[PDB]
Copies of this chain bind each other. A is one copy, B any other.
């Protein structure tokens, strides 16, 4: 987990509008929703945000709750997990499910490719 990086996060109580600004400043496709203590609760992309505002929904009710995750303690032999399931983003969490990092497919693909 030296391959991991820091994710862009947003608190659950924030507004969808706040989410919009963040992605823009940071120029990212996706952001992670956490609580005050950094526990992962969700994931948002631009499309979700638009559907949310259009529907007048809170951030909590707009985020994706289903996420595939990997433990901080896990060795970098969970590459198969990212590859088999083919997900752009994989969050890294601790034993308490607090967000600590993020693993990207593009980056993973790159490591393999570079290695071969």
Binding site for B on A (CB under 8 A): 40-41, 47, 51, 54-55, 61, 64-69, 71, 73-75, 77-78, 80-81, 84-85, 87, 97
Contacts and interface: CB of A to CB of B under 8 A. Distances in A.
Q: Counting chain B CB atoms within 10 Å of each CB, which of A61, A68, A71 scores highest? A: A68
Contacts of A68: 64-66
Number of copies: 2
A55 B69 contact: no
Contacts of A51: 78, 80-81
Given A54-B77, A55-B74, A55-B75, A97 B47 contact: no
21 contacts: A40-B66, A41-B66, A47-B81, A47-B84, A51-B78, A51-B80, A51-B81, A55-B74, A55-B75, A61-B73, A64-B68, A64-B85, A65-B66, A65-B69, A65-B97, A66-B66, A66-B67, A66-B68, A66-B69, A66-B85, A66-B87
